[PDB]
Amino acid sequence: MFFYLSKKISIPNNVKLQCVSWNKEQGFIACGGEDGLLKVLKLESNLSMNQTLEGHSGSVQVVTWNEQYQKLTTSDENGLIIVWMLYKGSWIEEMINNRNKSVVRSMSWNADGQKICIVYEDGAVIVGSVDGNRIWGKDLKGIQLSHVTWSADSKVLLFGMANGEIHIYDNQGNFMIKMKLSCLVNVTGAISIAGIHWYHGTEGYVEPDCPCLAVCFDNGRCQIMRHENDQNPVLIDTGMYVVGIQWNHMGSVLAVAGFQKAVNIVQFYTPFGEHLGTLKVPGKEISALSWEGGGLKIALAVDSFIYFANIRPNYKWGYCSNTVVYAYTRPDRPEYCVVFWDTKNNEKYVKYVKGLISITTCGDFCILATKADATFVLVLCNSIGTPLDPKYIDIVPLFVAMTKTHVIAASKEAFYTWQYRVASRKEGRERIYHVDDTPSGSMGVLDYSKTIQGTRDPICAITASDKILIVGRESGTIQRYSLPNVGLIQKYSLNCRAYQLSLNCNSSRLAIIDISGVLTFFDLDARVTVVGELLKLERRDVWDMKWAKDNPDLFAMMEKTRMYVFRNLDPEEPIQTSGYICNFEDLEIKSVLLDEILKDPEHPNKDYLINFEIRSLRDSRALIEKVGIKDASQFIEDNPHPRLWRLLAEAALQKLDLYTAEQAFVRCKDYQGIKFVKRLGKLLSESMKQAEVVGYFGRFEEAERTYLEMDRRDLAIGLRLKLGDWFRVLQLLKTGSGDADDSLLEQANNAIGDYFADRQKWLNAVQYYVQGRNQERLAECYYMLEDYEGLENLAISLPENHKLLPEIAQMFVRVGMCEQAVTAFLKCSQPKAAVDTCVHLNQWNKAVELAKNHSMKEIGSLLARYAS
């Protein structure tokens, strides 16, 4: 949750803006003027910079988009309502209405855009449809209204009085109970609302019954209630005349605009009352807010300007294996939807999770720490989403740090250690420590009497690498323990509160991004005469970082809208991008554009995955491009690293040197590469080696087309046979002719039958196994399908003897058919197992007949035994 100003559009002739409403569906910014100015702006720099001065004498006070119907609305101080509709790329002036008594204090469209409620200062209220203004016009009492708001269902219609009393209405004029104001208890002076915003659930709720409504008063105290509460997150703010309130589009961050005495401020709160920051807008006085549709930009009025402020929200994302995990809420279901988008196969695996405090990934695993109905859960997941092991823990899992061997989920006063793997499956040794416990090297198990002591110095962030554990406290006193067996080693007492902490591979250097944007580097193991020190570097607006998994020195950060790569504190030309570093490895950085993905969560494009290369690999690649492999080999020799060498080898193999490439493949211990080079050496034909190498990089379709073009169907069939593309093998066998074509045909049919049969897709395996000649699997496929007439045909089709006839007869016995079972057994050898069934299946007469047929009627008694 970081945030900074971006741009300052300006309005001519220093007019004083009083109202800003950012349309959510279409990014139109409609800004009211102080002298009849009403402008409509749009970005991408402005695209639709417009001046709809049609009408609007005097000043302009209130403006509301109609999200549905895209009908703008505006009011003057002359009581002149106007509606604007977009005709041929411009805004025009229609549904002009005017009531000549008083001034339109506020307006609001319904949750569905069908009804508009307008409140006048003298108290009169008019509610109209999209077309006919006068559905229900009420004149109320000796009161002065200032606000109006609909509920989620457009049922209640809570006015807001001048004196600071909210009145709940009915969808008509049925005064219900006044709201019980809890935010103000000790206040004494006059109170006006100055901001109400009911968040209709339109992207779903952050929490299944989270607060939606938001009432603040201009003295500075706010209360975020659900419907009409009686207890509700009470907030105090210092904003002298808090002048605005604005929910997020997801109803997840509440932006409160005012100014302290001290000067302009835009404070934020989460829906439960947790503070998140402060913006410090310049200028004289803010007047209004407006979030974008995508929640990324907040546009706010100052004097004669529109200052735009960027926001980086707290996405719940991760990167485990080749998978981008990212969670979002949707209106129809009440639980978080989490998408394990497997990038390599472009497959999605949507799960649904109830609590979802946070997502953490490290390696091929992912802890979705949640809240249950043993009260909290840590769902340890695959890279495909299947939960391997839900571990119920008691402490509230606010901060999770995952190492390969251990997880750590820590509340504000304790942290809990659970070992989920061995460098290889569950070997759990759970423990709980208080922060001030000072455990020794090793020891109690699962003692939950330490999570309840309570402290004055809460935990603000934690991290853990493979060797050490660093717990940050809100007084900056990071505490360092020995991870495999928790024990307090050292304390450091940094300067500022930590928001995110990370360790390099060697676990000697530590990066702190504080609650503001500040980033520093700290050195844990370097003795100054003290123990640790800052490291004389500091950036400004950092909002993500990722060390290299291989190199201790390499480091990456996203500052503002740019990425810097540090090699031991020496930055490099900033790449321009707005994405989150997924991976940093082998001199390559994989990052993803979450903002574009989350505008279309159902269909993530592969275009949103971006790979960058740090300088060194770029120099190697560009130099191999410019000069020939012969020189670039010497250059890469100057500065060794296996990624570079493999790049050299692949460049050579592309050029078919086969002499440079083998040297590279030895410079990276790579016996596979050497063996492939030798095999390539055996080939004595060009356009054959070319096919082999276009197979080397995995361009199988290109290799197959090449094989066909040089008139070698044989090798194309063979290649598709080595892999599993049996459908391709069938298609290729459809045309041309080869040395053994039935053999491949039959083999391919049987193989496709096996392909389906393992996935339990009979009636598809059975289509094959028949064009192919299979018997062993075929009977099983019939059986699992309950197609007993088919088993019967197969049993009457096999030769006189076979290995399969006793098996089919067993199947018939279990399913219960006796006639068919006897005929099966008779077809095979045993008649004694043809009579044992008849007795077993109680058709005794036929058993007697058989016994007489084959003369072994030792079953005399049995019939009389069953005569009973």
């Binding site: 207890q231 391997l388 063996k675 892999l723 059986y783 279990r814 399913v815």
Partner: protein
Amino acid sequence: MRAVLTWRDKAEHCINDIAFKPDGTQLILAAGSRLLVYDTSDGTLLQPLKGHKDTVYCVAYAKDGKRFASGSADKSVIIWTSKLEGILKYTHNDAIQCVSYNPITHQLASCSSSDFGLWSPEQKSVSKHKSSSKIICCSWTNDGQYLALGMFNGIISIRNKNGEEKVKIERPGGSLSPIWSICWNPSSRWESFWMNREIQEIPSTLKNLEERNDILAVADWGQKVSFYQLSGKQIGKDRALNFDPCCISYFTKGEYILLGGSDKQVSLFTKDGVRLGTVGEQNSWVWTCQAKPDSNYVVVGCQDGTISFYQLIFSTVHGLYKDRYAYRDSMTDVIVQHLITEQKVRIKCKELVKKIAIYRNRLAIQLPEKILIYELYSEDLSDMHYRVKEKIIKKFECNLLVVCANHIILCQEKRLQCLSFSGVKEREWQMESLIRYIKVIGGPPGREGLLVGLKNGQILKIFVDNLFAIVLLKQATAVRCLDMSASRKKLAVVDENDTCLVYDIDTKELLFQEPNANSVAWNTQCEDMLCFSGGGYLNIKASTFPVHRQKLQGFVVGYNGSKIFCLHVFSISAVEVPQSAPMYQYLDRKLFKEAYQIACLGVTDTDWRELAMEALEGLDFETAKKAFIRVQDLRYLELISSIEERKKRGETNNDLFLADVFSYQGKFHEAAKLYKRSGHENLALEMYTDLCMFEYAKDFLGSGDPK
């Protein structure tokens, strides 16, 4: 539906009107000239409130939690508060019959024989408005805007907060049918308005509606109950009754009705008025019946002083075949749910649905008076158009219902009866002891299997065609749950000691035991996969391995592919099995073919690659081929094909192949020794020279110096 009796404390006098604290903790009854503040928890009492002189005829609470009134015959309405005191005592000219607050504004409305008063809490006087006849029931609308007055006259006044008579409802039969209880349906958006709560001095006296969706349910004393909208239009048709009504209410979310009345019993109708059973048969008339708020608990007061505090338990009714799960909803509907496409379908039955039995292209629903047999007709795997096939009409008494294609099976004590869809009793088996479980196990379309488990301990397979039980086992204790393996070869038995026993059905032999089980479901797709659920823990074995237990609320109903279907309070839920753990279990024992069989159910790519490597080193090249195909590595596949084409020709040694595999992964040292052990060090020399690791190739010159 079933009702258990928590306590039955009885008072000395006849009960008049009962009222719950909205918290749901104390219920202030009416008994003589005193009010009794009980405790729902146990049945205990606090004191008979004493402020009243005369007999009490009504009581109410405030939907807030503090003020609560108590009309009486001493012609006064004392507005008692919490902490058990009394604050206003405004009076009337007559006995106050019923006094109910407003659910929004707390505007108390207390009627009597001649006139009903209103008193808003801020109001300094009571506004009296004249009435036609004796007012007997008050019920404010959910939004607190209308207060409707039934009366001995037999005419339902509806009036607004001021008291003007908006509309008046006429009950045919006139004064012969005095409305004696009414109630407004409490399901609305306002229902949660009050879910987020936190010197007796007198009071002076003083003397569209078509779009609205509400229903005023009216119980006459002409033996009927109807349902009237707010505009006076009737819904449906009067519901005849044999008992003379004396109480009509609703549950917490207004999804039922209690009724009761003259006869000594309290029913439970649906919102539509169909009977659905009986809470209980009382000792004297029932004058009041109110469900507890946000609970299944109802409470009955009678003309004995007896107060009973019941708990209704609604028994789960469901059936399942493979991916289709039909269950009972609202006690008169049947929801058939696909477990894959999740395309629900509702079937309306209009009477109580007792038993739901399903089978492929069949759906049987036992109504109280008849049995409906439904058929899926289209030949689509996802088809969900159930059409009515037959209606075997007869009062049936049966413990268990199982439906087969072209038959129906009724278990009734020890008799297993097989009826056709037409109705005829085709067959009957006289099983020798109590039938505890019964389950269809597939087969031909008409002649099918039934797996019948007895309390005797016996286990029988019965074919619908032949009238002879086929025994399977004789394990000891009663068989509470059974199941049969995917191949009909292995049986799983759970026997009134939570102990899943698994038997080999053809050798009558045990294989293993597990010590917690309420429900066992073998995999439908892979034979070797069991899944019990005992004591709040799921458990998934694979053959004779340790279990993988999670935590879970509910019990297992099915197991298809990778999905544990668990049921918990009418909510199906699919738990995704971790196939990777059994895969690794199989790999450690060097069972590669089974490991692949389990892996096919869906695992990650790293697990696929791990299985592929471990197949190679274990020399099961077919499993390795299928694994690597599913990861698509041309390098390893071409290695394996090279090894296979070598073995096709004269190549048998197993240490050369393993040495090649180790070399080709990158050990470079274990591969060296493996090459050494076979009669090829020359291969080791070539390996080390190719890696140019010449320091090592110094001591693999075993041949000597022959150039």
